[PDB]
Amino acid sequence: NLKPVDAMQCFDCHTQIEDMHTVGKHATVNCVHCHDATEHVETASSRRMGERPVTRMDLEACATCHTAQFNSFVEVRHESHPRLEKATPTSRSPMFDKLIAGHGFAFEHAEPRSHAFMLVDHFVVDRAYGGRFQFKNWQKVTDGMGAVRGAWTVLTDADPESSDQRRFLSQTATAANPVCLNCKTQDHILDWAYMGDEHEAAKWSRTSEVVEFARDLNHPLNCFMCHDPHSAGPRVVRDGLINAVVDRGLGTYPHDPVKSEQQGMTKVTFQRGREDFRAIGLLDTADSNVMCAQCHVEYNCNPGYQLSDGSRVGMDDRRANHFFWANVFDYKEAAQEIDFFDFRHATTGAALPKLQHPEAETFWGSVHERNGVACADCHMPKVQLENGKVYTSHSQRTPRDMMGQACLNCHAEWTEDQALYAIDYIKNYTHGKIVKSEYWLAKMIDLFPVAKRAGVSEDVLNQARELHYDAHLYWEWWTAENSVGFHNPDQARESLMTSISKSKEAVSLLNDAIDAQV
Amino acid sequence: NLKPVDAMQCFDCHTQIEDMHTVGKHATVNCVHCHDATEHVETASSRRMGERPVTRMDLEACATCHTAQFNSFVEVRHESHPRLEKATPTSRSPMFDKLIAGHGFAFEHAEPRSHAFMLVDHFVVDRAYGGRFQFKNWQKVTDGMGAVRGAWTVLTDADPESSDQRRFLSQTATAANPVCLNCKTQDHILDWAYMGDEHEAAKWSRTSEVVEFARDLNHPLNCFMCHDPHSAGPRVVRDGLINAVVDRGLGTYPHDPVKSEQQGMTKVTFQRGREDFRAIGLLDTADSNVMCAQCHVEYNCNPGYQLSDGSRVGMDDRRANHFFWANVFDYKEAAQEIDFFDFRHATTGAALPKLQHPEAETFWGSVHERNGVACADCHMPKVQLENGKVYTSHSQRTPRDMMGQACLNCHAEWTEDQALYAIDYIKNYTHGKIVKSEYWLAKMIDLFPVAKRAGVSEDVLNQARELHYDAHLYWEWWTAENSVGFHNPDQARESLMTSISKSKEAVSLLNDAIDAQV
Ligand code: HEC
Ligand code: HEC
Ligand code: HEC
Ligand code: HEC
Ligand code: HEC
Ligand code: HEC
Ligand code: HEC
Ligand code: HEC
Ligand code: HEC
Ligand code: HEC
Ligand code: HEC
Ligand code: HEC
Ligand code: HEC
Ligand code: HEC
Ligand SMILES: [C-]#N
Ligand SMILES: [C-]#N
Ligand SMILES: [Ca+2]
Ligand SMILES: [Ca+2]
Ligand SMILES: [Ca+2]
Ligand SMILES: [Ca+2]
Ligand code: NA
Ligand code: NA
Ligand code: NA
Ligand code: NA
Ligand code: NA
């Protein structure tokens, strides 16, 4: 059985913790629930850690007092199809292989599934670790609670004796790097300096051997990513988000300075040896838009190249961990701002961006966002009980499973079927424009080999490559973004029509140039 | 195909109809929809009918232009169990045979079923016509549309060559009389003088041979019972109701003079020659409480006896067609006012009232009635359509079949299961008190033979008989009333506790008197 410790003894040194813990709703929660610090207390000084205390990062540390929220979080949505490749005719991007050629996502890019699986899915996807990590067997794919208990309870490593990234299976890639893990787990929260910069107190950084880092990590989406364990108050912990909002002064709502002030973020820094080490962002309100934006954003978490001279930008560079914090129509400028692109297209040679799941930046300026609606209202609503204590559902999933709470309490004029119909109108329309955008991208791409072999000039090919950047950006935003336009239907429409326009321009350019060589 | 007539010519002699028809929502509906007056127009003067025009009473006269209301009305609710005798342990009155002994309802008293069957059910019930009328075969009991097309399309008469009331089956009664038919049909609306008084212009009256009258009647619950066919406005046609509300000055809401004035009734009389003949009551508002009270009331529609001297009150007497228009606690006074009782109990010899379905008089003063709710809100609600023209459902049935529209639009705090649970709490409690009331009534009744045979005095027996009147009234109101307390739970509770108190007093009186003789 747990035996409480004297928190006043800790507070003698830990004044920041005192200030947070004594005031919030965890003022009665003893440190022993999450820390084993006996040897630490025997050896520490006011400025030197001494023996390092044990800190629990497992989600079951919160589940004995918050079982309802834990059990809701760990539920597996079986209707969220697992390991479903997006580059197929029945998924999100039928022509993805042709369009993404040259990028690691060509090796595998599946649709997302329930949050319990995020860390194991990261470890086992074919693009990440060369096939090094696999489920122990094909039964384990069902085991959401097991994944939550720990990744290494359900996975194997093909070679525990080596730590290099290499291919164990032929059609895999080794794109994983330490930055990725920040959106899968925060088990490393005490072992990683802010931004992954080199730091004498950090075991891990942007330049670490990612296979070694992986082996030290266990739990997905820790409860403390959104809730400070000491104050119980709302927060974020993701460095790239704090960097955008606070360090670069862009605010929580870059398009709305008033909402940014009302729903702001305060950066709190913790030190090692009286040097800044790590940071958190305390929120003014329990604002899920910003909580979810720790991960559901467009980012850099990877090496790339400079737009200016084509030189390599490695993991050592700050730009390898970057939140652009820009909507689709501001993105090209944001990428120019840091002089960065992701890959050269394998067929066209164009410098291209790689977009990823920009839900937060897409939601900005939408009708729902402008009306004060937030991610949680549609994706983790309050539970409705005939008789009971209300709590917030932590099963983050499509509103289709809980339409009464997610939509119909606000939209009293609609039945469930009417609300579903409105979602599908947008998704069907948007998907049609995604498909047409891909058709035109593909038509352009297929002209590049013909143009090159016919002797079309480098100047014309470069003009077409410049068009390819924009045609790509204004399409791929929407295959990356998970709502198929629902989050901002007018923006999707405008973007996708722009993509098509750019590809059509490039097709005309290249056809005319080819025809002139004949 | 129908050919329109020149209505202006009719109006030269029918100013009363002109003033209604030209102003209301049937101003464009030609008379040929409901009248065949060709030979009438050829032979009439303004002071001489000439040949009698034909008037359609069938509901299909309205269904041509109002199919949705007609089809909703004629629907059969199969879940409303048919021919289900109330004097059984699993229905409303487990001890009914003992308690009602001496009255015709002992022969058969079934629960109500859908409105389509009202006229056929009246004709075929074992207590009504000595078993003379039967369904043609046992298949016809399902045929609601056929019954509406006409009773004699689905029934047979055991002896078309005779018109006397007599028993054709051994355990039947011949309680039917012409007053009954006024709550089953209004096919006779032009052939029956106000109250069924004798009149030169009336084919039928209170004193008619009911078997002959029955053969002239076809359709249940005519659409024009609630809607004037000329103005389309709200009305009642039932003489007994107009007599209580208007002639006797009691008002539409006897307990609320303000509501009576706002939601009142105007008596309109129609003449034959110089003499008043029939009447209707035009309503100030479309008030279902008053529409439904044409039938869902306690009434006399039968011969009886005088409380003063025990003499017979026959069908010729106006008291044989009477709406008491009194709540349960005013009823005994109302029956004393007309010096009337129904039957002498077969075992106790007590003069007793017979109560029938007093829904209107029970609903008065209830929380719902005081809040301006009316029968239609729970039993005939507006249809809710995702896309469509709203109409009023005419399928008058339990709210359990349409809880969203009947209850939950007002009670937003409840789920369907919660609302059902609240109904059942009241019905379960009320039924327990009905059962306990019957237990005590039965205990008293069973002491009468013992007391009589022991030589208990007539004075003591008469004391106990006076107690029996009250014990009976305060019980039977609630087996008669169809809501099992829901329409007025506090009144049911007070009444049933009074019944039990009266029976207990009588049991003590009789036991002590028997014990004293021994
Ligand atoms: C003064 C002698 C201390 C006492 C008493 C306690 N702690 Fe401590 N702790 C101390 C230092 C100098 C540091 C390094 C950071 C700093 O503020 O300079 C720490 C660090 C921790 C940590 C972080 C460990 C990690 O892995 O990074 C934890 C979780 C921690 N301390 C907890 C803790 C508890 C629960 C105490 C009461 C039992 C406690 N500390 C006392 C110095 C001192
Ligand atoms: C779980 C419900 C916790 C309770 C109770 C306490 N702490 Fe904690 N602590 C917890 C976690 C998950 C972490 C990791 C960092 C984060 O922000 O989530 C920590 C960290 C600390 C630290 C380190 C701060 C730093 O310099 O980086 C300290 C010094 C610390 N915790 C102290 C501490 C004290 C004294 C507590 C009892 C009053 C206490 N914690 C409770 C989780 C939980
Ligand atoms: C029991 C010993 C607890 C442990 C372990 C954890 N929490 Fe807790 N929490 C506890 C209490 C008694 C309360 C207050 C309840 C109330 O409403 O009065 C809380 C509250 C929270 C909250 C709400 C905070 C707020 O609204 O300001 C959150 C978000 C919360 N707790 C989160 C949480 C986390 C993430 C935990 C594991 C790190 C955790 N709690 C552990 C009791 C206990
Ligand atoms: C936060 C800014 C992220 C970083 C850094 C990385 N990932 Fe991610 N990933 C993130 C989200 C919000 C989602 C769900 C939404 C979606 O569009 O899928 C994902 C999903 C994955 C998946 C599952 C789906 C799939 O593509 O097969 C995997 C396998 C995955 N992520 C791997 C991964 C790798 C290898 C990363 C570094 C190169 C990486 N992620 C970083 C958020 C974030
Ligand atoms: C008993 C007669 C079985 C039947 C019927 C089914 N399965 Fe099975 N399965 C069985 C065993 C003994 C094992 C191996 C257990 C171990 O851990 O050693 C399995 C394995 C699987 C797996 C994993 C396959 C892999 O290559 O790792 C899966 C996905 C699986 N079983 C699914 C499954 C399905 C869906 C079944 C019905 C169609 C089915 N099994 C039947 C034993 C038996
Ligand atoms: C960010 C993605 C979250 C993660 C990770 C966890 N929770 Fe959470 N929690 C989140 C939100 C948006 C809210 C609602 C805030 C609001 O006021 O609208 C909550 C709330 C809680 C609470 C408070 C009580 C309640 O409303 O249910 C508790 C106790 C809580 N959360 C606990 C908790 C646990 C145990 C988690 C890991 C299993 C967890 N939260 C993760 C957002 C996020
Ligand atoms: C209601 C007004 C919403 C708000 C606020 C947010 N989202 Fe949403 N999201 C919504 C719908 C109707 C859909 C389509 C769901 C469907 O089943 O068709 C989505 C989709 C997503 C997804 C993908 C879900 C899945 O396909 O399984 C994700 C990952 C998602 N949304 C994330 C998300 C974020 C992070 C939000 C705040 C920035 C956000 N959503 C808000 C409706 C609504
Ligand atoms: C004057 C020359 C008349 C004309 C033109 C029409 N009607 Fe008539 N109608 C007239 C009289 C004198 C009476 C009898 C009044 C009385 O004292 O009893 C009637 C009666 C009717 C009736 C009721 C018949 C019944 O069953 O009692 C109806 C339905 C009726 N009349 C209809 C009607 C129509 C539709 C006419 C135009 C086609 C019409 N009448 C003309 C005198 C006259
Ligand atoms: C059906 C939609 C009708 C239309 C159109 C007209 N009439 Fe009618 N009328 C109808 C009914 C069912 C009855 C029976 C009585 C009742 O109140 O329901 C009548 C009655 C008459 C009478 C008799 C009035 C009386 O003195 O008792 C008359 C004189 C009469 N109707 C005339 C009449 C005229 C002239 C019409 C065309 C303008 C007309 N009716 C239309 C049903 C319907
Ligand atoms: C078509 C030739 C009709 C026949 C036959 C009947 N009705 Fe009618 N009715 C008709 C019309 C064009 C309207 C007006 C529609 C509108 O809203 O503009 C009506 C109206 C009614 C009403 C509503 C009256 C009101 O709200 O004031 C009722 C209650 C009604 N009609 C009843 C009714 C009856 C009982 C009929 C048979 C005797 C009947 N109608 C026939 C058209 C036609
Ligand atoms: C209006 C004041 C009525 C009079 C006059 C008569 N009845 Fe009736 N009856 C009426 C209603 C509102 C109901 C339904 C509610 C209920 O408690 O049943 C009924 C029902 C019947 C039934 C069906 C149920 C049954 O008792 O088996 C029959 C067979 C019946 N009524 C016959 C009947 C007789 C023979 C009447 C004259 C002696 C008579 N009714 C008059 C309303 C009215
Ligand atoms: C064909 C092999 C039949 C089977 C199977 C069922 N029924 Fe029948 N039924 C059948 C006939 C030829 C008749 C007589 C038709 C006529 O009008 O002459 C009937 C009659 C009935 C009746 C009426 C009985 C009466 O005495 O009037 C009923 C209520 C009835 N049938 C119901 C019924 C049920 C519910 C059946 C399944 C259990 C059933 N029948 C089967 C022919 C056949
Ligand atoms: C009294 C017991 C009624 C009988 C008999 C018929 N109807 Fe009716 N009707 C009734 C009510 C209480 C209402 C609603 C009044 C309100 O405003 O709340 C209606 C309404 C109509 C209407 C108007 C349009 C609508 O609201 O649907 C029509 C056209 C109508 N009723 C037609 C109609 C028919 C054709 C009938 C015989 C099948 C019939 N009504 C009988 C009450 C009563
Ligand atoms: C809602 C507040 C109601 C009002 C207004 C009226 N009634 Fe009602 N009634 C109501 C309930 C909940 C019930 C019980 C139904 C059940 O399924 O348990 C009833 C019952 C009846 C019945 C019997 C129905 C059946 O058992 O099939 C009748 C004949 C009835 N009610 C008639 C009626 C009258 C005429 C009303 C106006 C005076 C009236 N009800 C109003 C709910 C409500
Ligand atoms: C992940 N991207
Ligand atoms: C009928 N009573
Ligand atoms: Ca999914
Ligand atoms: Ca990117
Ligand atoms: Ca019934
Ligand atoms: Ca009576
Ligand atoms: Na899905
Ligand atoms: Na392996
Ligand atoms: Na091709
Ligand atoms: Na029933
Ligand atoms: Na209905």
Residue where a domain stops, chosen among A413, A441, A470:
A413
DSSP classification of residue A183: G
Q: Which residues pair with A343 in a beta bridge?
A: A352
Q: Are B204 and B325 in contact (CB under 8 A)?
A: no
* Cα–Cα distance for residue pair B167/B160, rounded to 1 Å: 14
The CATH number given to whatever domain includes residue B253 is 1.10.1130.10
* Cα–Cα distance for residue pair A374/A359, rounded to 1 Å: 12
- How many angstroms does the Cα of residue B56 sit away from the middle of ligand 8? 14
Nearest CA in chain B to A414: B386
Instruction: Specify the 3-state DSSP secondary structure of B159.
Output: coil
Q: B432: closest CA among B475, B473, B468, B472?
A: B475
Residue B126: how many CB atoms within 10 A of its CB?
Answer: 19
Cα torsion B325, B327, B330, B336 to 10°: value is 40
* Cα–Cα distance for residue pair B433/B438, rounded to 1 Å: 8
Instruction: Specify the 3-state DSSP secondary structure of A112.
Output: coil
**What tokens does B394 get?**
């005419």
Same domain, A513 and A430: yes
The shortest CB-CB distance from A418 to any of B386, B415, B417 is to: B386
Same domain, B403 and B449: no
Tell how many helices (H) and how many strands (E) occur in chain A.
20, 13
The CATH number given to whatever domain includes residue A15 is 1.10.287.3080
Check the annotation: does A33 bind a ligand: no
Instruction: Specify the 3-state DSSP secondary structure of B397.
Output: coil
Residue where a domain stops, chosen among A390, A413, A436:
A413
> Which helix (H) or strand (E) element contains residue B338?
none
Instruction: Specify the 3-state DSSP secondary structure of B205.
Output: coil
Same domain, A262 and A394: yes
Nearest CA in chain A to B385: A415
- Whether A71 and chain B come into contact, CB under 8 Å, resolves to no
* Cα–Cα distance for residue pair B198/B185, rounded to 1 Å: 20
Q: Where are the alpha helices (DSSP H) in A274-415?
A: 288-292, 328-337, 359-363, 367-370, 375-379, 403
Same domain, A302 and A408: yes
- How many angstroms does the Cα of residue B288 sit away from the middle of ligand 25? 13
End-to-end CA distance of chain B: give it in Å, rounded. Answer: 85
B48 lines ligand 8 (CB under 6 A): yes
Q: Using a 6 Å CB cutoff, which residues line ligand 6?
A: A 59, 62, 66, 69-70, 73, 221, 223, 225-227, 286, 288, 291-292, 376, 391-392, 394
Q: How far, CA to CA in Å, does B512 sit from each of B450, B509, B517?
A: 12, 5, 9
C-alpha of B235 from chain center: 16
Same domain, B268 and B339: yes
Angle made by CA atoms A220, A221, A226, in degrees to the nearest 5: 160
Q: Which residues pair with B282 in a beta bridge?
A: B235, B266
* Cα–Cα distance for residue pair A206/A199, rounded to 1 Å: 11
Experimental method: X-ray
Same domain, B392 and B461: no
Check the annotation: does B301 bind a ligand: no
Atom of ligand 4 nearest to the CA of A481: 17
* Cα–Cα distance for residue pair A212/A129, rounded to 1 Å: 12
Q: Are A175 and A104 in contact (CB under 8 A)?
A: yes
- Contacting residues for A168 by C-beta, under 8 A, at least 6 apart: A130, A131, A132, A158, A159
Angle made by CA atoms A196, A24, A148, in degrees to the nearest 5: 50
The CATH number given to whatever domain includes residue A516 is 1.20.140.10
Structure's resolution in angstroms: 1.5
> Which CB contacts under 8 angstroms, 24+ apart, belong to A491-496?
A491/A327, A491/A328, A491/A329, A491/A362, A491/A365, A491/A366, A492/A362, A492/A430, A492/A433, A493/A429, A493/A430, A493/A433, A495/A328, A495/A329, A496/A430, A496/A433, A496/A434, A496/A436, A496/A437
Interface of B with A in 376-395 (CB under 8 A): 386
Which letter, b or e, does each residue of A205-230 get, where b requires 16 or more Cβ atoms within 10 Å of its Cβ? bbebebbebbeebbbbbbbbbbbbbb
Mapping DSSP onto H, E and C, the string for A200-235 reads: CCCCECCCCCHHHHHHCCCCCCCHHHCECCCCCCEE
Residue B432: how many CB atoms within 10 A of its CB?
Answer: 11
* Cα–Cα distance for residue pair B501/B103, rounded to 1 Å: 24
Q: Which residues pair with B133 in a beta bridge?
A: B157
Residue A196: how many CB atoms within 10 A of its CB?
Answer: 27
Same domain, A372 and A235: yes
Q: How many domains does chain B have?
A: 3
Q: B468: closest CA among B442, B511, B506?
A: B506
Tokens 């609302």 belong to which residue?
A: B419
Which positions in chain B touch A386 (Cβ < 8 Å)?
415, 417-418
Same domain, A273 and A324: yes
Residue B385: how many CB atoms within 10 A of its CB?
Answer: 9
* Cα–Cα distance for residue pair B414/A277, rounded to 1 Å: 54
Same domain, A129 and A259: yes
> Which CB contacts under 8 angstroms, 24+ apart, belong to B227-231?
B228/B20, B228/B24, B228/B280, B228/B282, B229/B26, B229/B34, B230/B17, B230/B20, B230/B21, B230/B24, B230/B26, B231/B20, B231/B21, B231/B23, B231/B24, B231/B25, B231/B26, B231/B282
Q: Are B205 and B193 in contact (CB under 8 A)?
A: yes
Kindly tell me the burial class for residue A115, based on how many C-beta atoms sit within 10 Å of its own C-beta (0-12, 13-18, 19 or more). Answer: buried
Check the annotation: does A354 bind a ligand: yes
Q: Where are the alpha helices (DSSP H) in A304-347?
A: 328-337
Same domain, B251 and B350: yes
Which positions in chain A touch B417 (Cβ < 8 Å)?
386
Q: How far, CA to CA in Å, does B108 sit from each of A29, A177, B122, B345, B359?
A: 73, 87, 11, 17, 21
Breaks in chain B at C–N > 2.5 Å: after which residues? none
Q: B396: closest CA among B373, B376, B369?
A: B376
Q: Which residues pair with B45 in a beta bridge?
A: B48
A227 lines ligand 3 (CB under 6 A): yes
C-alpha of A103 from chain center: 18
Check the annotation: does B10 bind a ligand: yes
Q: Are B323 and B359 in contact (CB under 8 A)?
A: no
- How many angstroms does the Cα of residue A169 sit away from the middle of ligand 22? 9
The shortest CB-CB distance from A415 to any of B386, B417, B418 is to: B386
Instruction: Specify the 3-state DSSP secondary structure of A325.
Output: coil
* Cα–Cα distance for residue pair B513/B518, rounded to 1 Å: 9
Which residue spans within A158-303 are E strands per DSSP?
A: 235-236, 265-272, 275-283, 299-301
Which residue spans within A1-56 are E strands per DSSP?
A: 35-36, 54-55
CA max distance for chain B? 86
* Domain span holding position B497: 414-518
Which positions in chain B touch A417 (Cβ < 8 Å)?
386
Same domain, A407 and A426: no
Residue where a domain stops, chosen among A413, A438, A462:
A413
- Contacting residues for B454 by C-beta, under 8 A, at least 6 apart: B513, B514, B517, B518
Same domain, A227 and A355: yes
